[PDB]
Amino acid sequence: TPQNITDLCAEYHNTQIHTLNDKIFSYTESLAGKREMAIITFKNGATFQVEVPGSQHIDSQKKAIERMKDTLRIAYLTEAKVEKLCVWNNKTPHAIAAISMAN
Amino acid sequence: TPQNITDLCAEYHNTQIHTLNDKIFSYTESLAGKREMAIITFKNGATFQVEVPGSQHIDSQKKAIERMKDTLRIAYLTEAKVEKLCVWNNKTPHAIAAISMAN
Amino acid sequence: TPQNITDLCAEYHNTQIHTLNDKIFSYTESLAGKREMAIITFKNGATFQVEVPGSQHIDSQKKAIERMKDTLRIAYLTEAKVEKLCVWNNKTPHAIAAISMAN
Amino acid sequence: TPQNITDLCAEYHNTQIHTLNDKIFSYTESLAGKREMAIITFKNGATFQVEVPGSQHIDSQKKAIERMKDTLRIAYLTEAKVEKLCVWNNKTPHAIAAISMAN
Amino acid sequence: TPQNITDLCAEYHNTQIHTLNDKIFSYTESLAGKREMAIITFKNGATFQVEVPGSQHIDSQKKAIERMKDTLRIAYLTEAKVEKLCVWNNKTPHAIAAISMAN
Amino acid sequence: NDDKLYRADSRPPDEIKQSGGLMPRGQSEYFDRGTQMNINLYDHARGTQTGFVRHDDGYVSTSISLRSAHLVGQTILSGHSTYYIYVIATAPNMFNVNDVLGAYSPHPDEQEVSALGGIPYSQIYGWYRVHFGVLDEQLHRNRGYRDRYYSNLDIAPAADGYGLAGFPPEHRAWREEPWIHHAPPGCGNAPRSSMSNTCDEKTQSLGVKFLDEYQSKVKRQIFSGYQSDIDTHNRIK
Ligand SMILES: OC[C@H]1O[C@@H](O)[C@H](O)[C@@H](O)[C@H]1O
Ligand SMILES: OC[C@H]1O[C@@H](O)[C@H](O)[C@@H](O)[C@H]1O
Ligand SMILES: OC[C@H]1O[C@@H](O)[C@H](O)[C@@H](O)[C@H]1O
Ligand SMILES: OC[C@H]1O[C@@H](O)[C@H](O)[C@@H](O)[C@H]1O
Ligand SMILES: OC[C@H]1O[C@@H](O)[C@H](O)[C@@H](O)[C@H]1O
Ligand SMILES: OC[C@H]1O[C@@H](O)[C@H](O)[C@@H](O)[C@H]1O
Ligand code: NA
Ligand code: NA
């Protein structure tokens, strides 16, 4: 069982860590059909999505996708510093798998 | 997969972008039957709705409609600057499809 | 489709607008059986309820009732100024149908 | 239909009002099996629970129990003054039925 | 029925209390398949998880796990002082069973 | 209690909102760490009021009445065709300068109360517009303010301010009451006060710690409010 996001990320083949150590610059949210998703950017231009729920997600991920969208919204609004993102890099933009926050 | 709200908006018929770069001036919320909806206005007088769930929405939109109403409420209360709205313009008032927030 | 709370209120029998332009003075919440409801008061003594879900509500209202109780809680705690309530006046206390908040 | 917590409390057997007029001193939360509950204390030593969901609750209470635990958490964190609790006094510690916040 | 986290913790095999009296240093959250979990650390290096829902959890715990992840996120962001954690110590990192916060 | 303080300032409300409050000179946003700036009350109080109302060296000064602040505004902010008087709640980020600096307060005449780290948006009750010296007696209420929280708080006791007083080490204040009993290391008769710079450092670090702890209180109040919409029942059905 991983004790940090880096160890967690290393358990998956199609993942990588981004180190940001910065607050989210922009938060975007959509309810348009087939694009029920969220997008965040950082001021350095890096862009990430929370994927539309699909058949590549198992049932236990569905609730976690919703949680992640919650987390990003509140992170944006409180200007919380994001340390690292773990993302799947076989998507454009890269798809968030995990987030870590520390001051 | 779009990387911003403008790209997202362009994927849909009967949509357009409004650029506001301002906090929400008013937020309205209703639980009256057949009018379970939200309305927001900006100080320039622009007015937008989150549509009542209906047959024009697919099932995956239902959760996102609820999310959007959450987002607008908290945006209003925190006086967050809204950057852009993507809206369907074949409704009156224009119906929100996506929102973006930036510093 | 109404563009404001006043227009919305006018669509329903047995409704009226209260103009408060004040923060909520008190918030009350119950989980007692058959009384799962919320009550708010203003400093002028005005008192309002969110009704217990019942057979007078259609299914689409159920989620909106829950949302409204959320909205009132967070409105109370952030000391947000409430502009107007639309209420059914064939109940005691008057039952909230819609709320508007404005800068 | 009651217009305040005192009137509400009087409708139930085995209930009592506590008048606290103070912020919550401590909040405790558990996900341990059979003890999925919350406990709050005040500085005067008074201690209250939100009961584990059980067969003494009807279905309509289940959502309200969850709401109450939300309310208490956020009440604790915002240091909101609790006016009165309505509690069932045939439990130890006393079980919250309703809360009122003012001032 | 326990009146505090210490009494609660004592009801379970393989649990122990940590007294931290400190804010959370880091918060991590994952939606990666089979690792839908949260991790927190304190500045003294102590590390704790909310476990992935599994067969060691009864159904009533599922909602409480979700609640606990909410609580930790909000605790992190508000810089709330955590008093004590009750944890299962037959997991690495130690798995949170309960949390207490006090003024 | 619900006592208010007042500060004439040229920075308008939109800039205050962006900065997250009324900022010391040098500080961009309220929730920046204290390491950004020099935090020293003595230094703050000695500053010249030429152009701006004192806001140097990690503190922002306020007056104890609307009238005081308007008068100060007409002296200092003579030149701005519009400035604002910010109405400000009392809270324990706020020190009475004359009490803390005592007999060494360099401007006892002005009875100033100063905020360590600046004044967060949430602590600002509202503002008056001042157009060509003419106060407009219609107050604008700040929607970011929390009356119930701040009405419950008062300014800091002087005893909480003595250690942060920020006299140089060789100063006789550290060798007299009350300050002697609150003196940082290296200050006063602590060995090598004149040679060490240990004094000015501990002053800084005690200041930064104070702001850290105070920022935690603000975050907890405001950001808890922001999360009071959460309904667990939605997600668990
Ligand atoms: O579990 C979510 C992930 O699923 C994988 O199969 C896919 O390669 C990723 O793009 C991501 O969608
Ligand atoms: O899904 C939401 C959208 O659905 C479309 O069919 C309709 O043209 C839009 O006005 C909007 O309702
Ligand atoms: O939809 C809720 C409303 O339903 C009506 O039928 C009733 O007359 C009102 O008092 C209110 O309960
Ligand atoms: O609905 C919850 C309540 O149910 C009652 O039957 C019980 O006597 C109370 O102690 C309380 O548990
Ligand atoms: O209820 C969950 C708990 O179940 C126990 O049996 C186990 O020893 C703990 O590690 C924890 O998983
Ligand atoms: O859906 C679960 C909950 O998620 C929260 O983040 C949201 O603010 C609430 O309104 C509720 O929707
Ligand atoms: Na990897
Ligand atoms: Na005060």
Numbering used by the authors:
A (entry chain D), B (entry chain H), C (entry chain G), D (entry chain F), E (entry chain E): 1 to 103
F (entry chain A): 1 to 237
Article, verbatim:
One problematic target is the cholera toxin (CT), the main virulence factor of V. cholerae. CT is composed of a catalytic A-subunit (CTA) and a homopentamer of cell-binding B-subunits (CTB) that are assembled to an AB5 toxin in the periplasm. Thereafter, the multimeric toxin is secreted into the extracellular environment by the V. cholerae type II secretion system (T2SS).14−16 When produced in E. coli, we could not recover CT from the growth medium. Interestingly, assembly into holotoxins was shown to be promoted by the A-subunit, which on its own is highly unstable and prone to degradation.
